[PDB]
């Protein structure tokens, strides 16, 4: 009933469909300054406090630039977000899983460095992952291999075998793009959703009439996907149950019965 991780005002649909109440800054993380991952783009609230840490991976030949929406939209709702670049454009999901792990390790280190823009902004104990395509698989692999992680949002996950995810205990929200021809939802995203233990808080939202890149910068679903992603991270990274209506109740139903959505699965309520 006391939630120490609680931040921002009581959520409204309209507030969650746009940049949040937290002023943010971004800096880049040079490839040369890190091993474990290929650098990337760091977004953080300027307000004093410690926030959940979120690492986001692009997919095959993907760059951090294509997911800056996720950096800005999540950070502005009260998170520290690192959208990574990979060691190589050709890294497979198991590799993207290690890099997400290492990027989260990096944020924890920088959190103790008085020179860092994120000095004392990172709650080391509250970590989440997300990613596009092979980055989505990577995010679910990292969540499997780091069960202390609070949340995973695989977005249009590629074809890591759904078998690999039968022991995921980390609350997982999967985005699908209905007319994805690169990672068809019916053979890729949906079997992964179904492979996750039913005791694991989970959710699948499928964007109607859109392709593999419907979740990326300019995909055309900033309002709805952002609102779902913010709500998933708030719910599980911040244990903020004010966000339940947006993933399980009235405001989720609004979204998931809307023309924008072609499929919806979940083990609600939570
Ligand atoms: C998991 O839940 C699904 C969806 O309701 C159900 O089909 C399946 O039997 C459940 N799995 C187990 C192991 O009970
Ligand atoms: Ca689109």
- Which residues are catalytic, by number? 133, 180, 212
Strands (E), the chain: 24-29, 40-45, 51-57, 79-84, 122-132, 151-155, 172-177, 202-207, 261-266
Query: Token pair of 41, please?
Result: 């783009």
C-beta contacts of 88-95 below 8 A and 24+ residues apart:
88/38, 89/60, 89/61, 89/62, 89/63, 90/60, 90/61, 91/134, 92/134, 93/134, 93/135, 93/137, 93/138, 93/141, 93/158, 93/160, 94/138, 94/141, 95/138
Phi, psi of 191, deg, nearest 5 = -60, -35
User: Angle, to 10 degrees, between the axis of helix 68-75 and the axis of helix 222-237?
Assistant: 60
Report how far ligand 2's centroid is from the alpha carbon of 121 (Å): 34
Cβ proximity of 36 and 102 under 8 Å: yes
**Resolution of the entry in angstroms:** 2.1
| Ligand with minimal distance to 219 CA | 2
Burial of 207 (0-12, 13-18, 19+ CB in 10 A): buried
Report how far ligand 2's centroid is from the alpha carbon of 117 (Å): 34
Cis-peptide, bond into residue 269, ω within 30° of zero: yes
DSSP 91: -
Pick the closest to residue 25 from 66, 62, 72 (CA basis): 72
Cross-strand bridge partners of residue 45: 24
Query: Token pair of 117, please?
Result: 């823009």
CA distance 127 to 124: 7
User: Angle, to 10 degrees, between the axis of helix 134-145 and the axis of helix 93-110?
Assistant: 60
Pick the closest to residue 188 from 197, 202, 199, 177 (CA basis): 177
CB neighbour list of residue 212: distance below 8 Å, 6 or more residues apart? 133, 156, 177, 180, 181, 182, 183
CA distance 110 to 114: 8
Whose structure tokens read 């040369």? 32
Report how far ligand 2's centroid is from the alpha carbon of 259 (Å): 14
CA distance 224 to 57: 20
Query: Token pair of 71, please?
Result: 């950096």
User: Distances in Å between the alpha carbon of 39 and those of 54, 99, 103?
Assistant: 14, 10, 8
Query: So where are the chain's domains?
Result: 1-270
Kindly write down the DSSP assignment for every residue of 112-144, as one continuous string.
Answer: T-TTSTTTT-EEEEEEEEEEETHHHHHHHHHHH
Cβ proximity of 8 and 77 under 8 Å: yes
Q: Are strands 172-177 and 151-155 parallel, antiparallel or unpaired?
A: parallel
At residue 180's C-alpha, the angle toward residues 179 and 184, to 5°, is: 105
CA distance 36 to 105: 9
Report how far ligand 1's centroid is from the alpha carbon of 118 (Å): 42
Whose structure tokens read 């919806």? 264
CA distance 190 to 27: 36
User: Distances in Å between the alpha carbon of 265 and those of 178, 194, 211?
Assistant: 14, 9, 19
CA distance 172 to 94: 18
Cβ proximity of 204 and 194 under 8 Å: no
Strands, sheet with 122-132, edge to edge from the N-terminal-most edge strand: 24-29, 40-45, 79-84, 51-57, 122-132, 151-155, 172-177, 202-207, 261-266
């Amino acid at each position: 009933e006391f939630n120490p991780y609680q931040k921002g005002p009581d959520p409204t649909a309209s507030a969650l469909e746009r940049n949040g109440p937290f002023a943010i800054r971004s800096t880049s993380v040079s490839r040369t300054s890190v091993s474990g991952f290929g650098g990337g783009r760091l977004y953080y609230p300027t307000a004093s406090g410690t926030y959940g840490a979120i690492a986001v991976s692009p997919g095959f030949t993907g760059t951090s630039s294509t997911m800056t929406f996720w950096g800005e939209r999540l950070a502005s709702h009260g998170f520290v977000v690192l959208v990574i670049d990979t060691i190589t454009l050709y890294d497979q999901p198991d590799s993207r899983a290690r890099q997400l792990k290492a990027a989260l390790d990096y944020l924890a280190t920088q959190n103790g460095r008085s020179s860092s823009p994120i000095y004392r902004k990172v709650d080391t104990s509250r970590r989440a992952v997300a990613g596009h395509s092979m980055g989505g698989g990577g995010s679910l692999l990292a969540a499997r291999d780091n069960p202390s992680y609070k949340a995973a949002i695989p977005m249009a996950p590629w074809n890591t075998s759904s078998t690999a995810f039968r022991t995921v205990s980390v609350p997982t929200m999967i985005f699908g793009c209905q007319d994805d021809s690169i990672a068809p939802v019916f053979s890729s995203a949906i079997p992964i959703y179904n492979a996750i233990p039913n005791s694991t808080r989970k959710n699948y939202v499928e964007i109607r009439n859109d392709d593999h890149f419907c979740v990326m910068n300019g995909g055309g679903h900033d309002a709805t996907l952002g609102k779902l992603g913010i709500s998933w991270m708030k719910r599980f990274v911040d244990n903020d149950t004010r966000y339940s209506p947006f993933v399980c109740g009235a405001e989720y139903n609004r979204v998931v019965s809307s023309y924008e959505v072609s499929r919806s699965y979940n083990n609600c309520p939570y």
